[PDB]
Design a protein around this ligand. Structure first.
Ligand SMILES: *[C@@H]1[C@H](O)[C@@H](O)[C@H](OCCNC(=O)C(F)(F)F)[C@@H](C(=O)O)[C@H]1O
Length: 440
């Protein structure tokens, strides 16, 4: 490609500037526990949904919990989870190769019912595929729903958590746990890590780009800019890790609250946001991510049902770019001369296969860019482009010149070499686009 009047920026790759190593199970999705009320959703029979997950990664994590986990009640025979639903989830995990984070009902359920449900999950799914149980979702927001009274605080929650933990461990001596399954904060997450650091495997935190309802309204323009609250919360998590030894995973995230915002969450801009977010958190030392979704929600990566079929929504294509990059070690990638295109981001990666890759997100809505790439020595680079004709498009999204098809079927159909002369490369990118470069 060539662009009309592009902003000419410099990208310098430094193979000696070592960052974090991306784990092979970094990618992931978060779903409502209420989906378990239908044993045909997370099922070996659901070959469509299993195909979408395999395309997002050979390894990844399925997280089940969410606000419906305070209303879902296990029974060995308001939503009900049966042995049959847990048996079918086991077969779904076998078909996808993914590992499981499983919510237990601390909001409305009993310690003894949680221990009974955990025992059946451990009996059926087993220790290798079960990563963690979580004891409630967003306990700091229990009062907003009246699930607890306004007086409920960290002290109260810690009492609940200990009662559930003790009851579960009696039934399941090897039960693994994560928490506290909420947004970063000083009154809940920091004291949780201090008190329970010997009882959990990792810290589970949540992130939504939209702020409180009294923040300025979320637009595509705002979604593309840096989020200083995200940088702060991520620093907070790094310090918990230094203090307690506990790594962190982002177990529930998406663009906007309450199932997302029409004209923002369901748009190609969400592919750029989600792809960029995956790399920003991996570079910060996060162990992984779980994009919330289900049904036909505005922000869901995968939409549909077993009866009607499943489709890749725009956000899925951001996650697909990450999937095709693969795992490896992050490297130095500094941008210069980039003040008139400030929302361009770039991430360089030494792939586990030994090839250098670069993931670029041109999140500038009104500036095409020309990137002069130094610090890569290769006889040939290829580009796969992440594209839609407008940032607010709800469809027309392609990666490598192709849409995702049925059951997550994808492969690239457009081959493009990156122009190379004097040990350097020059890549044009349209406004609001992304690219994955791979060097021989
Ligand atoms: C985290 C919370 O745990 C989620 O339950 C909540 O999702 C509510 C909307 N649900 C959906 O879109 C569904 F059902 F999955 F399709 C999200 C959120 O507010 O979006 C968050 O609070």
């Amino acid at each position: 490609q060539t662009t009309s009047s592009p902003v000419r920026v410099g990208l310098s790759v430094d193979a000696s500037a070592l960052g974090h190593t991306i784990p092979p199970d970094y990618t992931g999705l978060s779903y409502e526990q209420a989906q378990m009320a239908n044993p045909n959703y997370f099922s070996g029979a659901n070959t469509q949904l299993a195909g979408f997950l395999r395309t997002l990664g050979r390894q990844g994590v399925l997280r089940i919990g969410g606000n419906t986990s305070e209303y879902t009640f296990w029974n060995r025979h308001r939503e009900v989870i049966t042995p049959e639903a847990v048996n079918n989830l086991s077969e779904f995990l076998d078909k996808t190769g993914w590992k499981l984070i499983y919510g237990l009902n601390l909001g409305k359920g009993t310690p003894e019912n949680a221990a009974d449900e955990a025992a059946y999950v451990m009996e059926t799914i087993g220790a290798d595929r079960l990563l963690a149980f979580q004891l409630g979702n967003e306990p700091d927001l229990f009062y907003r729903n009246g699930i607890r009274p306004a007086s409920y605080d960290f002290a109260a929650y810690a009492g609940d958590w200990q009662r559930f933990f003790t009851a579960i461990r009696k039934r399941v001596p090897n039960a693994p746990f994560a928490g506290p399954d909420t947004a970063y904060n000083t009154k809940w997450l920091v004291p949780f890590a201090d008190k329970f650091k010997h009882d959990v495997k990792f810290i589970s935190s949540h992130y939504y780009a939209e702020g409180p309802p009294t923040d300025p309204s979320m637009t595509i323009e705002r979604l593309m800019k840096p989020n200083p609250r995200l940088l702060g919360e991520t620093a907070g998590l790094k310090q918990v890790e230094a203090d307690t030894g506990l790594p962190f995973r982002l177990t529930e995230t998406n663009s906007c609250y309450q199932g997302g915002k029409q004209g923002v969450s369901d748009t190609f801009a969400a592919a750029l946001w989600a792809g960029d977010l995956m790399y920003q958190q991996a570079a910060a030392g996060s162990t992984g991510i779980n994009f919330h979704g289900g049904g036909y929600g505005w922000y869901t990566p995968v939409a549909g049902t077993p009866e009607d079929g499943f489709i890749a929504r725009p956000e899925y294509y951001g996650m697909l770019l990450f999937a095709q990059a693969g795992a490896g070690q992050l490297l130095g990638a500094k941008l210069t001369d980039n003040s008139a295109a400030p929302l361009l981001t770039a991430y360089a990666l030494r792939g586990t296969d030994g090839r250098t890759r670069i993931a670029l997100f041109n999140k500038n809505l009104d500036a095409d860019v020309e990137v002069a790439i130094s610090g890569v020595a290769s006889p040939s680079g290829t580009v796969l482009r992440l594209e839609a004709p407008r940032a607010d498009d709800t469809t027309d999204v392609t990666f490598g010149g192709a849409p995702v098809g049925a059951s997550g079927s994808w492969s690239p159909l457009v081959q493009e070499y990156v122009p190379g002369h004097s040990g350097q490369f020059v890549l044009h990118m349209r406004k609001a686009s992304g690219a994955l470069l791979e060097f021989a």
